[PDB]
UniProtKB/Swiss-Prot annotation, chains A, B:
Record keywords: Apoptosis, Cell cycle, Cytoplasm, Developmental protein, Differentiation, Metal-binding, Nucleus, Phosphoprotein, Spermatogenesis, Transferase, Ubl conjugation pathway, Zinc, Zinc-finger
Binding site for Zn(2+) 2: C36, C43, H55, H60
Keyword Methyltransferase: no
Portion of the full-length sequence here: 93 to 282 of 282
Protein name: E3 ubiquitin-protein ligase SIAH1A
Known catalytic reactions: S-ubiquitinyl-[E2 ubiquitin-conjugating enzyme]-L-cysteine + [acceptor protein]-L-lysine = [E2 ubiquitin-conjugating enzyme]-L-cysteine + N(6)-ubiquitinyl-[acceptor protein]-L-lysine
Tissue: Widely expressed at low level in embryos and adults. Expressed at higher level in testis. Due to the high similarity between SIAH1A and SIAH1B, it is difficult to distinguish its own tissue specificity.
Pathway: Protein modification; protein ubiquitination
Originating organism: Mus musculus
């Protein structure tokens, strides 16, 4: 009956729990310092939820932004050497959703593409939405529907487990035109 | 004049025309002998369009036949070290559509899956349909929609170019249950 751990009370975590449920509570605690949602270990920034957007606008380059729950993101030069990440912020339902398209080079001889959507918010908040990604081509269509992850959790684990849209260089050429790739992104509430 | 003969003219094409252009007509000839539409290169059977189905029933008992334009194919034992092909025949709209799921590692160590549907008929008849493949899971869906290939063309090219549904062991892990994988297959007339 002794409540004591939780290393986040300082950040406003007015909660006290037993030592048996410490390790688990912390990983998914609400008051755990959010990391920079941008792909890449380049930005070491850390801070609170409400500090995220400001961090992205002021201390990061100009990211493309689109209004609406149904839009089309154009990832240009998907073949360009050096290209590895495409980021776009989607504003709808009073929230901001980050779309990330990552191109990873694999040792076994191929280049994979990972597209996923992250909500600039909490896990319980993310659970209320659903996103759909579409690659539309001539008489062809590749679609991925799933629940957006919260930036708290990150995109890394999901990408590691292929829990997102996964395609590759060859699939990307099938849908691309003039070296550019259009990705339909649709977000909806449950 | 001196008209170049079609090698398949014996079957039923009195359409004898010069080499130059018309020689390319053979590739799209309505009377070319059809090879066995089964995955791989093992079976050397040859024959007319009207003989394909009886051949599959006679030589390939491992085919799972099903009725309807909206079915669910259950590919059992996807993780097994010996699984490589899963074939299912779908009968609808007066035709037969062959679903093939191939497990192959183009890249070393990386097991990938290729799912595609081919019509037992001419490519022109194929042009009149469209198919949809779905991997349905808990709060997630992977869908592929495209035009079915004609058995005359084959599968080899689509798979090499990734013009079909492409996933791997990891992605399968998100959908499979009890070692089995359910694939929704819907066929519709254009
Ligand atoms: Zn806490
Ligand atoms: Zn940052
Ligand atoms: Zn086009
Ligand atoms: Zn001919
Ligand atoms: Zn055969
Ligand atoms: Zn690989």
């Amino acid at each position: 009956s002794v409540l004591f751990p939780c290393k986040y009370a300082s950040s406003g975590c007015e909660i006290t729990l037993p030592h048996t449920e410490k390790a688990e509570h912390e990983e998914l605690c609400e008051f755990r310092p959010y990391s920079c949602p941008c792909p890449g270990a380049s930005c070491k920034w850390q801070g609170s939820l409400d500090a995220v957007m400001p961090h992205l606008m002021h201390q990061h380059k100009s990211i493309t932004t689109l209004q609406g729950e149904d839009i089309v993101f154009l990832a240009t030069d998907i073949n360009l050497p050096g290209a590895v990440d495409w980021v776009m912020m989607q504003s709808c339902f009073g929230f901001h959703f980050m779309l990330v398209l990552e191109k990873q080079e694999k040792y076994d001889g191929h280049q994979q593409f990972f597209a996923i959507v992250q909500l600039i918010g909490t896990r319980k908040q993310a659970e209320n939405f659903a996103y759909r990604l579409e690659l539309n081509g001539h008489r062809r269509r590749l679609t991925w529907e799933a629940t957006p992850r919260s930036i708290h959790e990150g995109i890394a684990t999901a990408i590691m487990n292929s829990d997102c849209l996964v395609f590759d260089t060859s699939i990307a050429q099938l849908f691309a035109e003039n070296g550019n790739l259009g990705i339909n992104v649709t977000i909806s509430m449950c």
